[PDB]
Amino acid sequence: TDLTPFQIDDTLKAALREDVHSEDYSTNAIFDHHGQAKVSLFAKEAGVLAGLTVFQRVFTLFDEVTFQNPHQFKDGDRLTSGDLVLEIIGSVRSLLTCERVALNFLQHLSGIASMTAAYVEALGDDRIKVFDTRKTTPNLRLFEKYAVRVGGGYNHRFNLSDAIMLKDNHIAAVGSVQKAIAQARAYAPFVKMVEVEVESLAAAEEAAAAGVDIIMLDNMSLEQIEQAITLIAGRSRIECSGNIDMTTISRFRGLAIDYVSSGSLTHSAKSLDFSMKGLTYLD
Template identity: 40%
Template structure:
């Protein structure tokens, strides 16, 4: 994400939460009061988003010091300190919820992604995300996938052609759909076609495409499809992929597996912010 875009996104998130002002904090804390606090992992997982979280706090206090205690993408254990910050108490309290929401969400996605990537150790197969992201958070969630060791699929509708069943039905046939797309897009744009059956795979291979999404095929059908394709186009398996099935699906020889629940169903990692100054403790 470009720095300007990143800061704009952070400001929008803070504005949503703060509105006309943090009336609780401003009523209780003097404007010049300073504090130190720690970000503490309450469970094991992979940390993602520390540089972004630092910017959240620094948006309200440009002089706030943020010291990460772990590397981005590092796996941590429960009750491990992941960052130490020092600055305006008002800024820390006011930015806390936005910062934690982002850090917990992104770390949860990175943790789940790492679990699936580890399942494919030794195989030449990537774990892909999808566009099934939270509106407004796609850049952050896809960053978390990369931090967890996964690979990003297209970021948006303008980043590549994906011909699904509804597109093909509207065009009248797959051949018509591919022809119409080629008239519209340049040679640099990749075209991927969704196929549910071996017959659709065979038809797609006769057309000028770059990739095939093999959707909801069982392992045996996937294996036959990969053999039929024989490296002519890039292959991606999707649908019915779980931690228990992902390795057997990858072993069919597909280039990648795409997993929507990386972003739409990941559980947030439990992380807290605790003040360490005397008199201000265990703020969550």
């Protein structure tokens, strides 16, 4: 589901203002006469397209700009270098001044979508979902979460307010898996999912017995993981997390866990290369 102007406008404005504090001298010195012009957006690298309407919105907040999409490209579609993703039509000053900010969004989000897509394939198991985390670029979580969905991934909680996750230390402070779970439930009844991070087979048992929604198996071995699965017997949903990357992710293939999660999808994504070229004046 696409991102809306309500959601993105303030962020894009800020970004435009970051890149232009007075004016775009280089563009304004050369270009004048205010003729309409056309520029093309080209993919320069293979991957997955994400953030296209975000890209567009940067231009549209700045000036009156229209678009042409010859190949009907949309977020999710596979890209190959040289592909004509969009044509952008408007005044020269608007096209050149808005370009870098627009691309910066598009490159970043397409990079994440691409990487998410790659992880899914590397895993090669539909039955196991690929989830993101809170290890996101500050103030862009919304956009990054979106890119992950686009790439075929799924969203974990957005927030510390969304859902409860009882980590390593939380159990210790209470001194029982069961008590930590109980206090969580008492504190925020009914309307919050509760998850627990567990390093131990005993703790996984304790937690499943307590009736939690999701159990996180933290950096556990395959032997350990397999035992836990049988032990839990579908009493909770099972997430594997930690030390999960392109090389590692395939180890989970075929297990009866519900999902895995990776921070790298959002904290360490390479951006995907695009360029805007072929500027011509309209007749």
